[PDB]
Amino acid sequence: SHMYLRITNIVESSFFTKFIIYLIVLNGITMGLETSKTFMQSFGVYTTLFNQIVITIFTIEIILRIYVHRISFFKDPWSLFDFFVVAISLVPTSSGFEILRVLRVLRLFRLVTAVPQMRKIVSALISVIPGMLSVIALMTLFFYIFAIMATQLFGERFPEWFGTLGESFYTLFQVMTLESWSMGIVRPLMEVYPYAWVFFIPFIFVVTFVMINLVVAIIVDAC
Amino acid sequence: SHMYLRITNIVESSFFTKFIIYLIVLNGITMGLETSKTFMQSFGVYTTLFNQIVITIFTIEIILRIYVHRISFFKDPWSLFDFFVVAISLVPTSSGFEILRVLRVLRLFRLVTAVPQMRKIVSALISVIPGMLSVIALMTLFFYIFAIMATQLFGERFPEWFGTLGESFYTLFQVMTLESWSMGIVRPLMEVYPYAWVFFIPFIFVVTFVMINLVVAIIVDAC
Amino acid sequence: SHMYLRITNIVESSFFTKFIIYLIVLNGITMGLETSKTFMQSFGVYTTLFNQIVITIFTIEIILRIYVHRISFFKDPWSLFDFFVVAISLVPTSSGFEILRVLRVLRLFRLVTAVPQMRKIVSALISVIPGMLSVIALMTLFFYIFAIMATQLFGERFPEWFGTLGESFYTLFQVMTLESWSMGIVRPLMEVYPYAWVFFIPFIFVVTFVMINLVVAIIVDAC
Amino acid sequence: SHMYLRITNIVESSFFTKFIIYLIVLNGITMGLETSKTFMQSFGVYTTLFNQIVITIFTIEIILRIYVHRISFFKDPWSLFDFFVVAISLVPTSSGFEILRVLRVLRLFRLVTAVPQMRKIVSALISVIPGMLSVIALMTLFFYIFAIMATQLFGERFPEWFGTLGESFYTLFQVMTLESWSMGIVRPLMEVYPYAWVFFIPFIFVVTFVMINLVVAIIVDAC
């Protein structure tokens, strides 16, 4: 435990944290810049290397933290995130699709993990998630039922919006958000199915009512 | 109570319920695939056969439950649903409209009945319904008053959106959801009726205020 | 007080009320019908006379109520409404504009006055109005300030939406409701005024924040 | 305290305040008319003259208040506003941009300062601001992360909406307000990026959930 505690002193050290938070904010500022074609035609490679540096440093740091915690680590939501967020950043710039190449910017999310209050907020938000799964389940069931009916009621003449179980899923979500649901979807639809309003108005009521209730439940049970 | 009790311990059995819930999730998955033209051609008839089976099994099951409960059953909302939902699934594939054929997917709602907690949610939600009928009535009255005025104020030059008492009902509901209410309806309407904004702004106010007051009456009462 | 109390017995009588509520619902049903060109080409005049009858009866009834209450009447919000709602219905079908001819249907609103619970609801809703005048004032001030700035910043090149203090008032309200504020108004506007987003985003924040607060105040102060 | 106290009893006087509030509502009305080209031509110069007068009077008044308070004044938010608001009104009509010329109508905001209750409202509102900076920070971080990813995922083929870190910022805010988010942006985007819905639906979820959780944290804490 000499080398160990010698490390634990660095890892648990203040300098360490602040230093990582420093690279987060420094790297974060560099990715908004590496966004400019112009800037990349100047300080282009600079930013590229600096990004390679930061990631190395972050791998070292992720390793050091594994020593000091080991099993305790792979049971920490926050460390697990930082783990997978750096691994993605590790996948070679080439091969497969550029998703990984873009998901890379997900590292700036470590400024939520590497900073309390942010952790508190995020924790507080998520705390509610579990209490809504009963409703979130009821909803997804509802959506599935209707998406199926819409695919087989309008997918024929309106393939763009309902030709597929998934196309219907997307359209029904757009209707839920109320986004041009009438001018954009139901009016056109009615030019062929005069009673389509019988399918959609009720759908907008249930989904709305639930959403509203879902919130009134949270507010109400507390105070 | 010889044959009766034999029937009851089965109907009232754990196996029974779970077996019914299993057919729900199986038929449910099957109707999702039955949505695919490809699968329709590559695994169709079997799916068609499976559906007929499920419904048969459900009729047997619905009968067994009326034995074990009789008059108790017809007074249970949850069973009444399961009743009418399977009945709809009974009407022959042909004849009349295909809605009865598309309405069958409504059986997947038995998973709300056959599963507690789901029952609780749906119960919790509906519990509020009656506590809003006063407002829901006031609103519907409001809508009727305005739908009539708009039909006779704009239906002449704007048949599509207000030519009928019901077309006005639809448009006013769209205005309530605030969907394209200005670019879509009022701006165009004003190209002919410069003061039309005198009709719609107040309407959007009343309807909005009431909606909000409605939700505020709900959570406030809780704390 | 013999003839008087003899009247007061009729006016305060149950039969009376129910009888007026009967004509309300009967007349209300007739105005939704008198909405159909077809129906008016059949039972056309019938409905016309029946509407004349109802209004006469309502004038008698309004007179009888003045006797029984006198000064107490012109201090009753509900009676005052019924008063002005019938007077409008009294103005000759001809002369001036058809507004009066259409405002006529405002009488069906007497089913809110002529029925408790409806009265309660409406009373409960309005109860809050006075407590929001401080905010409603702040808002209108805000709107006036911005409507002025927008008229003089965009009315030049965008006269349809801001060429007038009032055109700007309408557009700013549409922006508040968030109705195609971006695609419809700001994007187009930015094709000429690159920083227009500096005027509108802040406007959407203030207006939104306030609206939200305005409600959180109500909810919160109670329980 | 000879000249000082003479100055104070005037500045601290009822007359003074009311006189200032009177000029606000007068100048306020005047700027509404100054909005009319007709009035501009039919009553213009007088209006122009009146405005110069008002501002002079307000400078005198702003000076008198710094005497009576001195260092106390510069530490008062309400007076600081009135200060900077009149200063802007001082910059010569010409030179630079006309914004300083349009920003003058911001003086009508002194009616929020010069009138209590208005001060209270604005104070009550702002009181909450600090109690949300944790979330407002988390959100802005979120927006930055996504604005960067979208600029490099769609800015190439969709310059208008995502070609710049800031164009993406604008579009993502529009998506947040849910304005044309589907018909307007995602549907079109999918014509090239079929999985783009994987980016936007989750974004609309996080942003929505947080917004709601935000308002729920506010009223709950109150009861």
Cβ-contact A173, D200 below 8 angstroms: no
Token output for D167: 């164009």
For residues A45, A47, A48, A49, the Cα torsion angle rounded to the nearest 10 degrees is: 90
Token output for D164: 């710049």
User: Do A136 and A218 have their domain in common?
Assistant: yes
Q: How many CB atoms lie within 10 A of CB B132?
A: 15
3-state secondary structure of A153: helix
d(CA B55, CA B24): 10
> Is C217 at the interface with chain D, CB within 8 A?
yes
d(CA A95, CA A15): 37
Phi, psi (deg, nearest 5) at residue D62: -75, -30
d(CA B156, CA B160): 10
d(CA A159, CA A154): 7
Last residue of a domain, one of B69, B87, B116: B116
In Å, how far are A1, A221, C7, C222 from D218, measured between CA atoms? Answer: 48, 14, 57, 14
In Å, how far are A168, C61, D128 from B219, measured between CA atoms? Answer: 34, 42, 21
Residue B35 with chain A: CB contacts under 8 Å:
148, 151-152, 164-165
Last residue of a domain, one of D82, D116, D150: D116
Cβ-contact B47, B33 below 8 angstroms: yes
> Is B197 at the interface with chain C, CB within 8 A?
yes
Tell me the nearest-neighbour CA distance from C77 into chain D, angstroms. 29
In Å, how far are C111, D65, D66, D68, D78 from D71, measured between CA atoms? Answer: 63, 11, 8, 10, 14
User: Do C102 and C125 have their domain in common?
Assistant: no
User: Do B125 and B98 have their domain in common?
Assistant: no
d(CA C215, CA B139): 20
d(CA B77, CA C192): 61
d(CA D167, CA D150): 10
User: Do A33 and A8 have their domain in common?
Assistant: yes
Tell me the nearest-neighbour CA distance from C20 into chain D, angstroms. 44
> Is C106 at the interface with chain B, CB within 8 A?
yes
d(CA C142, CA C140): 5
For chain B, what is the domain count?
2
Asked if D182 lies within 8 A of A178 by C-beta distance, the reply is no
Asked if C222 lies within 8 A of B222 by C-beta distance, the reply is no
User: Do D109 and D143 have their domain in common?
Assistant: no
Residue C179 with chain B: CB contacts under 8 Å:
178-183
**D32 annotated to a ligand binding site:** yes
> Is C124 at the interface with chain B, CB within 8 A?
yes
Residue whose tokens read 């003449």: A157
Instruction: Mutate one of B142, B143, B148 to test the C interface: name it (highest C CB count within 10 A).
Output: B148
CATH assignment of the domain containing A142: 1.10.287.70
Q: How many CB atoms lie within 10 A of CB A94?
A: 8
User: Do D100 and D189 have their domain in common?
Assistant: no
Breaks (C-N over 2.5 A) in chain D follow: none
Token output for C68: 């029984």
Token output for D50: 């009146």
Asked if C128 lies within 8 A of B204 by C-beta distance, the reply is no
> Is B32 at the interface with chain A, CB within 8 A?
yes
Q: Where are the alpha helices (DSSP H) in chain C?
A: 2-11, 14-33, 37-40, 44-69, 77-90, 99-103, 110-113, 118-128, 133-154, 159-162, 165-176, 187-190, 196-222
Burial class (CB in 10 A: 0-12, 13-18, 19+), A186: buried
Tell me the nearest-neighbour CA distance from D121 into chain C, angstroms. 7
Instruction: Mutate one of A193, A209, A213 to test the B interface: name it (highest B CB count within 10 A).
Output: A213
**Residue A96 DSSP one-character state:** S
> Is D201 at the interface with chain A, CB within 8 A?
yes
DSSP letters, C54-112, are: HHHHHHHHHHHHHHHHGGGGGG-HHHHHHHHHHHHHHS-SSSS-THHHHHGGGGGGHHH
**Residue D93 DSSP one-character state:** S
Nearest-CA neighbor of C152 among D35, B35, D42, D12?
D35
d(CA A187, CA A201): 12
Residues 6+ apart with CB under 8 A from B218: A216, A220, B128, B131, B132
> Is A29 at the interface with chain D, CB within 8 A?
no
Report the b/e string of D183-197 with b at 16+ CB within 10 A: bbbbbebeeebeebb
User: Do D127 and D179 have their domain in common?
Assistant: yes
Cβ-contact B112, A141 below 8 angstroms: yes
Tell me the nearest-neighbour CA distance from B127 into chain C, angstroms. 20
User: Do A108 and A126 have their domain in common?
Assistant: no
Tell me the nearest-neighbour CA distance from D109 into chain C, angstroms. 8
Instruction: Mutate one of B174, B181, B207 to test the A interface: name it (highest A CB count within 10 A).
Output: B174
Q: Which of D134, D178, D220 sits opposite A222 (nearest CB)?
A: D220
Residue whose tokens read 């909803």: A139
Report the b/e string of C131-153 with b at 16+ CB within 10 A: ebebbebbbebbbbbbbbbbbbb
Cβ-contact D125, C209 below 8 angstroms: yes
Asked if D35 lies within 8 A of C183 by C-beta distance, the reply is no
Q: How many CB atoms lie within 10 A of CB C79?
A: 17
User: Do D89 and D155 have their domain in common?
Assistant: no
> Is D37 at the interface with chain C, CB within 8 A?
no
> Is D29 at the interface with chain A, CB within 8 A?
no
Asked if D181 lies within 8 A of A179 by C-beta distance, the reply is yes
Determination method here? X-ray
3-state secondary structure of C164: coil
Q: Please give the annotated binding residues of A, written as ranges.
A: 32, 36, 164-166, 177, 180
Q: How many CB atoms lie within 10 A of CB B15?
A: 8
Asked if A204 lies within 8 A of B177 by C-beta distance, the reply is yes
Neighbours of chain C (3+ CB pairs under 8 A): B, D
Phi, psi (deg, nearest 5) at residue D110: -65, -20
In Å, how far are A176, A178, C76 from B177, measured between CA atoms? Answer: 11, 7, 35
Token output for D158: 């969709």
d(CA C94, CA C140): 37
Last residue of a domain, one of D85, D116, D147: D116
| Residues belonging to chain A | 223
Q: State the sign of the Cα–Cα–Cα–Cα dihedral B7, B8, B10, B15.
A: positive
Q: Please give the annotated binding residues of B for Ca(2+), written as ranges.
A: 177, 180
Q: Which of C118, C184, C218 sits opposite B138 (nearest CB)?
A: C118
**Residue D132 DSSP one-character state:** G
Residue A184 with chain D: CB contacts under 8 Å:
182-183
Cβ-contact B144, C105 below 8 angstroms: no
**D42 annotated to a ligand binding site:** no
Cβ-contact B212, A212 below 8 angstroms: no
User: Do B93 and B170 have their domain in common?
Assistant: no
Cβ-contact B109, A145 below 8 angstroms: yes
> Is B102 at the interface with chain A, CB within 8 A?
yes
Residues 6+ apart with CB under 8 A from A43: A33
Residue B181 with chain C: CB contacts under 8 Å:
177, 179
> Is D89 at the interface with chain A, CB within 8 A?
no
Tell me how many degrees the CA angle D72-D77-D80 measures, rounded to the nearest 5: 75
> Is A81 at the interface with chain D, CB within 8 A?
no
| Residues belonging to chain D | 223
User: Do C158 and C95 have their domain in common?
Assistant: no
SS3 sequence, D31-74?
HHHCCCHHHHHHHHHHHHHHHHHHHHHHHHHHHHHHHHHHHHHH
User: What resolution, expressed in A, was reported for this entry?
Assistant: 3.0
Token output for D53: 């007068």
Cβ-contact A47, A40 below 8 angstroms: yes
In Å, how far are A155, B20, B51, B103 from B108, measured between CA atoms? Answer: 20, 11, 12, 10
Tell me the nearest-neighbour CA distance from C151 into chain D, angstroms. 7
Token output for C122: 């409406």
Range of the structural domain that residue B88 is part of: 1-116
Q: How many CB atoms lie within 10 A of CB D31?
A: 21
**D177 annotated to a ligand binding site:** yes
Q: Which of A152, A210, A220 sits opposite B223 (nearest CB)?
A: A220
In one letter, which amino acid is B182? S
Phi, psi (deg, nearest 5) at residue B170: -60, -50
User: Do C218 and C180 have their domain in common?
Assistant: yes
Nearest-CA neighbor of A170 among D182, D191, B105?
D182
* CA distance from start to end of chain C: 50
CATH assignment of the domain containing C41: 1.20.120.350
Token output for A25: 């904010």
d(CA A111, CA A82): 10
In Å, how far are A182, A221, D210 from A214, measured between CA atoms? Answer: 25, 11, 14
